[PDB]
Amino acid sequence: TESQIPKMYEMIRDQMRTLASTHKIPLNIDHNCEVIGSIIMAACTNNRDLRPVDKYWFLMGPAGAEVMTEVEIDIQPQLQWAKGAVHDPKYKGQWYPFLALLQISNKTKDTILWQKYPVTQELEISNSLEIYANGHGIKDRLKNSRPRSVGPLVHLLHLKRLQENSPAVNGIRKSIVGHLKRQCIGETQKAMINQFEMGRWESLSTFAASLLAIKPRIENHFVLTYPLIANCEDFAGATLSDEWVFKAMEKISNKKTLRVCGPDEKWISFMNQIYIHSVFQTTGEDLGVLEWVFGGRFCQRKEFGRYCKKSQTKVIGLFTFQYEYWSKPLKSAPRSIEISCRPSFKGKRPSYNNFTSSFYDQVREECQKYMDLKVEGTTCFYRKGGHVEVEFPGSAHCNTYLFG
Amino acid sequence: TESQIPKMYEMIRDQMRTLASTHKIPLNIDHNCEVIGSIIMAACTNNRDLRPVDKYWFLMGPAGAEVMTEVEIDIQPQLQWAKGAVHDPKYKGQWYPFLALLQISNKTKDTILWQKYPVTQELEISNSLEIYANGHGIKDRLKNSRPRSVGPLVHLLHLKRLQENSPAVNGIRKSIVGHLKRQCIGETQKAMINQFEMGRWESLSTFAASLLAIKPRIENHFVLTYPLIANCEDFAGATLSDEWVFKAMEKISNKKTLRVCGPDEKWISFMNQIYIHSVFQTTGEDLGVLEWVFGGRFCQRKEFGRYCKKSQTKVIGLFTFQYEYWSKPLKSAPRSIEISCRPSFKGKRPSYNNFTSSFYDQVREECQKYMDLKVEGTTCFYRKGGHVEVEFPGSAHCNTYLFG
Amino acid sequence: TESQIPKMYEMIRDQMRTLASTHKIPLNIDHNCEVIGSIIMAACTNNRDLRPVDKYWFLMGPAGAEVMTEVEIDIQPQLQWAKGAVHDPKYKGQWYPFLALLQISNKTKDTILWQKYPVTQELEISNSLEIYANGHGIKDRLKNSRPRSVGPLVHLLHLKRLQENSPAVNGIRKSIVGHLKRQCIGETQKAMINQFEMGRWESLSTFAASLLAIKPRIENHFVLTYPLIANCEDFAGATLSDEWVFKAMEKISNKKTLRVCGPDEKWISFMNQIYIHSVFQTTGEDLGVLEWVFGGRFCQRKEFGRYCKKSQTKVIGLFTFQYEYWSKPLKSAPRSIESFYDQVREECQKYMDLKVEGTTCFYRKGGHVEVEFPGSAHCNTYLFG
Incomplete structure (x- = not known):
């Protein structure tokens, strides 16, 4: 799974700079990279969408003299390489799984700045539940490539979409439903998710309420955004389950070459945190988590x-x-919920006593199990510079969220 | 935004006195200033509407001997300057935004004395809602320059006008509609303003009913009138978001040089309050607020x-x-109506849960919230002599207005 | 109009061969080009009608060994350009006007082979009025792109449809009614068309009787069809109002590389005349006029x-x-004169009496020399007359 990761990042950047440097598009602006990067990886998954030549918003100007204008770019040199990677045996069939992760992380900046709740509104549930509506707008092939990363509500929306869209319909739903059950580990949630499959959504608000209590499993992977890919020059130890991403992306921050865009200079702190929000797919977590892990306060959208x-x-x-x-x-899943003598023979041995002396309720019973939980997460953390176990002691910004 | 404000006020007064003093038009009469100033606004935006020479009504007479007569004046010296300021880069493109603010405020006196409802009547709604029909009669270029200041009903009228007026049709409407949604913060209002975009004016009375309940966001800026501009000799700290305007035109009141015109001497109190209403855009503001803010009773039009x-x-x-x-x-908006964890990260956190377990109705549901809101304003009111926060406590004239 | 046409046929021709050559679909069969071109033309305006991948009837076989079968094609590479050419500034907004010209001309063959009269039957008028009922079945965007090319009867049908189906209704009908007035230059017809505006179709049979006499203005544009566009290798002087089109498609005939399809080989003369009937908009026009113009006999559908x-x-x-x-x-209009039923009949007699047809004159091959049509032998017979 992680064997092909080191070789993937280098060629992404190679084409990423190829399109920008061809038309003198500087790669030290986030907006140039994000638009270019969105164009670069578009040919990988939705080949027929982007035009071979088109004008997009970029920052044209040398040494800080950049300004918005529409620059025509020739994407055709970058189009051929992407389609040949679709079925190239060098990826061992991991091209689709790798491409699903890229779209989710990079579209996060648009979601952060433009706070929208498409899945929950289409699901008619509380708007504070885009938490499990991750992976919306991704290609269905990608949604069948890494459905685990795509949030259950999007699949639940796709389950709703499939019910509101023929034996080929079942094949899409079984991937949709099956990965709904894999993500949601709740014993009561799994049963009521199967009831969502037939087409009812009466306890979808209860599912909305349950999602507040029980946290479904959400697989995460550390993937850089478009500006960091173009600004990262090291990919030798590029994996997905170590400190390489934290160390390498810090090196990009240490270079201080990349610039960020915003309505006004107050957003410099906000947009810097968006990188941290988007790289680790850890956008809507507690500020105290971000304060302890990253040693700095995170500005909310309300500010x-x-x-x-x-x-x-x-x-x-x-x-x-x-x-x-x-x-x-x-x-x-982070919230993990994982004495009497019964002599079976006529024979006598000393007896020792180790003890001195509705579906919604069952759903709330399982919901009640996750209120009493005090330790989330799976194993442990690691400090910067190694993998030494460091448990979170507490922070003053706990229970406060970016969109909360 | 406020960078060009200090330099604009001094140079407007220079042309304000140049036209009046050329033909011996005293600037201590409000009518002389208003009619001269009404000529001044014409040269700025609608350059082709005012005659180069014409006779207008002024008060001619020395030391209180002013009598009503038509005086021919030469506006050509002011015409060449105004057209050159239209695209002068010294304003950083703020000439149109600055001119739109001036045009709306100076027409308030005519509307107060001649009580007309051109927008609400043309919108077939309650006439008592012209407060949200601010910015009528303004140039369309100005209405596309500061559409936020132009009230939604005028835009809603212009939305109605455009539906009752070709790919250039959409361009005018998108600015009209977009600033309708920006002004009206109602979630249900926004969905039903878009109904008015396609001509579904059945909820137009509902919008009038909603406007009585939901108060749309109306941007305000403290701009003086022609009688005060010609009598103001200080513009060093001329900004738009502090107490400078309140202190600057108090000195004009302290000078007691400007005289006001009316049918008879009973209007001296009414016309003095017109300056308060016009300068601070407090025509629709609560008289209980106004009496508390300005320390004096405000006479109504019915008197x-x-x-x-x-x-x-x-x-x-x-x-x-x-x-x-x-x-x-x-x-x-003066009335503003602005619970679980997202496990995007593998944090082992102390799990806290904060829960222990018709469209017109939605419009009325949102209507009830603003009825529930008793406090009015964004943050607070400030006392004279600084920005010390003093919340409005109430008065005998609460829930009363000038035209109420 | 004709400014972009020299370069604007090139992009049309580009997608004609790419889709067929990808799946080894030979382009020397008309039916292969007819369906493929229809698929390409489908993506031009009616983007949601065709499928990204689908099977259609073509002729598969190398060097004359074509046995018919349905062939899957990947239309997705050809879908992107058609939608992007709609608002491409290189066309200066002429894509819809030309696609309206393109869509109308490319649907002619099916009507000839299966003789149907859809416009007149819904209009409850004479079925022989199948010359002025141009532009039927075209997308409404194209119908608003070249309403002049769309015949009055189709607009009259749309006028009848609009009365037998909101401030947007007026905008559609005013184009419908206005181009009815524009196409039908009959002064009595216009007020008699104005009778049809709110539904006084009592003169609709009179309008059918009028169209016998008064020939409504039908704008024409010399636009090639699917087989000829793929077989046309020159577009430098490609315009719409000269002899370039006549000279360009003659060279295709001299090549003798395109093959036609039909139930039996008796249609070879018929199929050859269909190409003549479609390029210059002479489907329901007198065959003798074409016989003088094209120097060959024309076969009627009755044959x-x-x-x-x-x-x-x-x-x-x-x-x-x-x-x-x-x-x-x-x-x-080909015929020019430059009780209310009696006035229409009075205007009808103004156009029965007219004998000369056209605007100025015909022109001889090799230039724009004014040559007047003298007559022919196989006249009095249309393709369906």
Whole structure:
């Protein structure tokens, strides 16, 4: 799974700079990279969407003199390589799994700045539940490539979409439903998810309420964004379950070459944290988690007004990052819930006593199990510079979230 | 935004006095300033609407001997300057935004004395909602320059006008509609303003009913009038979001040089409060707020008969003003209605859960929330002499307005 | 209009061969090009009608050994360009006007083979009125792109549809009614068309009787079809109002590389004339006029029985063509005069009496020399007359 990771990143950057440097698009601006990077990886999954030649918003200007304008770019040199990688045996069939992760992480910046809840509204549930609606807008082939990374609600929406869209329909649903059960480890949640399969959504609000209590398993992977890929020059030990991503992306922050865009210079802290939010797929977590792990407070969306249009975003400063701790990605669910004598013969032996003396309720019973839980996570954390176990002691910004 | 404000006020007054003093038009009469200033606004935006030479009604006479007559004046010296300022880079493109603010405020006096409802009547809604129909009669270029200041109903009228007026049709509407949604913060209102976009004016009365309940966001800016601009000699700290405007025009009231015109001397109190209403855009503001903020009762329109014609307005007394409090301009709506964990990260956290377990109705559901809201404003009111936060405590004239 | 046409045929021709050559679909069979071109033209405006991958009837076989079978094709590479050409500034917004010209001209063959009268039957008028009912079945975006090319009867049908089906209704009907008035230059017809505006179709049979006399203005544009566009290697002087089109597609005939399909080989003359009937918009036009212009006899539809099924159309011969004259496309009405029923009949007699047809004149092959049509022998017979 991680064997092909080191070789994938280098060629992504090679084409990533090829399109930008051909038309003199500087790669030290986030907006240039994010638009270019979105174009670069578009040919990988949705080949027929992007035009061979088109004009997009980039920052044109040397040494800080950049300004919005539409620059025509020739994507055709980058189109041929992407399609040949689809079935290239060098990936061992891991091209589809690898491509599903890239789309989710990079679209996060658009979701952070433009706070939208498409899945929950289409699911008619509480708007504070995009937490499990991750992986929306991704290609269905990608959604069948890494369905585990795609949030259950998107699959539940796709389960809802499939019910509201023929033997080929079942094949899509079984992947949708089966990976709904894999993500949601709740014993009561699994039963009521199967009831969602037939087409009812009466306890979808209860599922909305249950998701508040029980946390479904969400697989995570550390993938850099477009600006960092173009600004990362080391990919030798590029894996997905160690400190390499934390160390390498810090080196990009240490270089201080990449710049970020925003409506005004107040967003410099906010946009710097978006990189940390998007790289580790750890966007809507507690600020105290981010404060302890990354040694810095994280600005919430409420602290700033509406994000200005991408056609009017201005470079607001350099990209910076720092961290003090890290851990292996969340493989299983974080909230994990994992004396009488009965002599079976006529024979006599001393008897020792080790003791001195509705479905919604069952769903709430399982929900009650996750309120009493005090330790989340799977195994442990690791400090910067190694893999020494360091448990979280506590922080003052706990229970506070980016969108909470 | 406020960078060009200090330099604009001084240079407008120079042309304000140049036209009046050339033909011996005293600037201590409000009508002389208003009619001269009404000529001044014409040269700025609609350059082709005002004659180069024409006779207008002023008050000619030395030392209180002013009598009503038509005086021909030469506007050509002011015309060449104004057209050159249209695209002068010295304003950083803020000339149109600055001109739109000036045009709306100076027409308030005519609307107050001649009580008309051109937008609500054309929108077939309750006439008592012209507060949200601000910015009528303004140039479409200005209405695309500061559409936020132009009230939604005028845009809603312009939305109605455009539906009752070709790919250029959409371009005018998108600005009209987009600033309708920006002004009206109602979640249900936004979904039903888009109904008005396609001409579904059945909820137009509902929108009028909603406007009575939900108060749309109306951006405000403290801009003086022609009688005060010609009588103001200080613009060093001329900004838009502090107490400078309150202190600057108090000095004009302290000078007691400006005289006001009206049908008879009973209007001296009414016309003095018109300056308060026009400058601070407090025509629709609560009189209990106004009496508390400005330390004086505000006379209503019902207390007086029909306003005499501008051809027969006579000097009725000296302009006076006083105030004890103020506030930052109302940026957002005066009435504002603004629970679990997202496991995006593998954190072993102390798990805390904060829970222990018709469309018109939705519009009315949102309507009830703003009924529930008793406090009005964004943050607070401030006292004279600084920005010390002083919340409005209440008054005998609460829930009362000028036209109420 | 004609400014982009020299380069604007090139992008149309580009996708004609890529889709067929990818799956080894030979382009020397008309039916292969007819369906493929229809698929390509489908993506131009009706983007959601065709499928990204689908099977259609073609002729598979190398060097004359084509046995018919349904062939899967990957239309996805050809889908992107068609939608992107709609608002591409290189076309200056002429994509819809030309696609309206393109869509109308490319649906002619099916109507000829299966003789149907859809517009007149829904209009409850004479079935012989199948010349002025141009532009039926085209997308409404194209119908609003070249409403002049769309015949009045189709607009009259849309006018009848609009009365037998909101501020958007007026905008559609005003184009429908206005281009009814524009196409039908009959002064009595216009008010008599104005009678049809709110539904006074009592003169609809009168309008059917009028169209016998008064010939409504039918704008024409010399646009090639699917087999000829793929077989046309020159577009430098490609315009819409000169002899370039006449000269360009003659060279294709001289090549003798394109083959036509039909129920049997008796249609080889018929199929050859269909190409003549479709390029210059002469489907329901008198055959003798074409005989003088093109120097060859034309076969009526009565000379042949019902067309065989598309699943059984076989190659019957090579495409041949010849011509001796041409004309600028008929921009205005061919007939020009430059009780209310009696007034229409009074105007009807104004156009029965008219004998000369056209705008200025015809022109001889090799230039724009003014040559007037003197007559022919196989006149009095249309393709369906």
